Design a protein around this ligand. Structure first.
Ligand SMILES: *Cc1c(COP(=O)(O)O)cnc(C)c1O
Ligand SMILES: *Cc1c(COP(=O)(O)O)cnc(C)c1O
Lengths: 405, 405
């Protein structure tokens, strides 16, 4: 940076702390990643200066010729990446992407069926303190108590009983492949729309390492950040028959001016995802997650669903008589970043939990491989088996430092 | 830029076109401005990589120590700037700021009283194609047919008849000072909350050049961009008694993860606004607007309300037998950027209009002064009085080029 250090010493010092923190820590939060310098440059551009309400070639303001090119690059690259008939790259966030789809097909009080929030469902899939649960009548399907895999007969029964207008598939803490074909079959049986929120798995979908929801879902929502490794924001994909309605839902429906600089950064990220090396990256993500899962089991940890098909895993800490909160806290002391997470049928509250959620997207971006997964698992074992030993925690600290260099 | 040109030639070429366009054109769109290099660097930072759901010291994820510093800098500087008891700097946009306030105090179907959308009210103040008009029962107050000033007796009568739970004051196309004291008096009479949407005038409020709504309003919403000259985004200010509710409305209410890099940029912008030179800038904005108004009247143009108290003016083009659409189009041909705008009691549709809206914030940022205002008015006169003369339009083109260098 050139201008920030001089103009705003306080803000610059804090940013610099954050940058150094990002390098020093082992980031295992499943939603996290590190974007490229090109992505950052794009959202640090003069495009922040442009109002462009509306859509390419259909704007409310003049002078949008070039931001139109940018937005269209984003839309076309997204369509290439996911094989979607239509993309809306304007959503400010994953929350707003979901908000727009809900606004499109639902009326206030309509019934929606989503994944149980304690089993992997997201806040925006019907939490009673979120607009979703306040504005619509959410009901939930569960995972099997033993296998922790989505019970598709439960999805079906809930759908048939409650007759939702919309079924939501996808998750923020589900370690297995989701069967979108079965979701669509159930949706068809009850005459419901199917929305798939692929935020966590979008990068894996782009790389052909998770089945693509696009052919089965009426609407697909996503973050551009997370496994897709883009700037912070949202996106909607849908069939052409819903394009006009979805676009109107975003604007003038729920948003005003789009963030054109962030949209530029989205275009850049999609460009990167279209490359062969992103496919290799995403495979390493999944490979690393399997390896980490295996290595954790070697240390004596129990994993929700007994492993992972994707980028993330959940450790059930009940065998170690630890809460997720305790684990999160002590790992923070040694420089490993995880979050507490409810495990299916968790006896603890969501604010304490019996689990931790772990993902490999971030460490994989940093160049970590299988050997590093083994060592991360070993450090986690050392820490969680010796929570009262400052000697053990100091060793862990040093081993974490060795990994981050 | 260093990395974008190599990584993404297509995106870079479009960005470069946009940058050159921003320099070449005379930007008179009232909502537009040009942010500092420091602001851009801040939102081009690694802070995009951090999930920080929740609030400073009360986050859902670990590792937020430094982004907490950044957010708190934003909140404290905002409180200094506007004398507010509480700030929420997380809203993704002005639309989301408004959305959160609505979510806080209203139930589905509640009555809200806002400014007539054809008289200066914003889309998010009850448009039937916007969430505001769909989710709540909006009624409108008007300006006087002759003076084009808000009719406060009409505000009062509408309030007493319709008994709104919420009254909204503020505008996207109102050229006069708004009397927030009178709005609060009316709100008090009918037991309604008062929300002031100061998006357009926020920079002027910060510089003491427009009365501050904070002491009179329960809630103040704003964009961080526009006259405040910050990054693209939103903010809510409120009394401490609503702080918890407002914070919960933003998260977990209507948004997910905040844009920490944009919040950094907000902090930077507020820092800039706190400086003496921003006060001088804002005075030049208002001075330039008066001068431009005066100069346009000298050319024979009629202005809505007969002039301006702020950064913006509206030309009533009926005396010249032109639509706003025609004016917008021809000015685009010579390198002057305006937008068509409905004038109070406009006989045309909102898609054709009898007016153009013009603001001076952008040209003032570029260093334009009184002499430049005179010349801009003269060029506008030349163009709109000679719409069929390519000779006149070419002269205008050359005069515009002379101004932008
Ligand atoms: C992260 C996530 C979201 C929310 O995205 P934000 O950008 O934080 O609003 C929504 N749905 C799912 C499944 C997510 O993982
Ligand atoms: C510009 C504006 C908005 C909307 O802000 P976005 O950032 O475009 O969502 C809302 N209210 C008023 C008065 C505005 O001027």
């Amino acid at each position: 940076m050139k201008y920030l250090p001089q103009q705003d010493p306080q803000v610059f010092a804090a940013i610099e702390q954050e940058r150094k923190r990002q390098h020093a820590k082992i980031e295992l939060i499943a939603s996290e990643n590190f974007v490229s310098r090109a992505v950052m440059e794009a959202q640090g551009s003069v495009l922040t200066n442009k109002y462009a309400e509306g859509y390419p070639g259909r704007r409310y303001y003049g002078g949008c010729e070039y931001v139109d090119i940018v937005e269209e690059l984003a839309r076309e690259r997204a369509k290439q990446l996911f094989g979607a008939e239509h993309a809306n790259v304007q959503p400010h966030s994953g929350a707003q992407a979901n908000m727009a789809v809900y606004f499109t097909v639902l009326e206030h009080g309509d019934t929606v069926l989503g994944m149980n929030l304690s089993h992997g469902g997201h806040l925006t899939h019907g939490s009673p303190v979120n607009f979703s649960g306040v504005q619509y009548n959410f009901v939930a399907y569960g995972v099997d108590p033993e296998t922790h895999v989505i019970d598709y007969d439960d999805v079906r029964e809930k759908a048939r009983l409650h007759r939702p207008k919309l079924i939501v598939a996808a998750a923020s803490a589900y370690p297995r492949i989701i069967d979108f074909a079965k979701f669509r079959e159930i949706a068809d049986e009850v005459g419901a729309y199917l929305m798939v929120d692929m935020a966590h798995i979008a990068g894996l979908v782009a790389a052909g390492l998770h089945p693509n929801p696009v052919p089965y879902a009426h609407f697909v929502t996503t973050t551009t950040h997370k496994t897709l490794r883009g700037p912070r924001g949202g996106m909607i994909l849908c069939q052409e028959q819903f394009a006009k309605q979805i676009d109107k839902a975003i604007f003038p429906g729920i948003q005003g001016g789009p963030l054109m600089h962030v949209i530029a950064a989205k275009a850049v990220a999609f460009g990167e995802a279209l490359q062969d090396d992103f496919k290799a990256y995403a495979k390493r993500v999944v490979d690393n997650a399997k390896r980490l899962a295996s290595a954790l089991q070697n240390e004596g940890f129990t994993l929700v669903s007994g492993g992972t098909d994707n980028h993330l895993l959940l450790v059930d800490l009940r065998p170690q008589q630890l809460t997720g909160k305790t684990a999160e806290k002590v790992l923070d002391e040694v420089g490993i970043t995880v979050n507490k997470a409810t495990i299916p049928y968790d006896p603890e509250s969501p604010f304490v939990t019996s689990g931790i959620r772990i993902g490999t997207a971030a460490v994989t971006t940093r160049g970590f491989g299988l050997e590093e997964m083994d060592e991360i698992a070993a450090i986690i074992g050392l820490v969680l088996k010796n929570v009262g030993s400052e000697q053990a925690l100091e060793e862990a600290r040093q081993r974490v430092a060795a990994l981050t260099d």
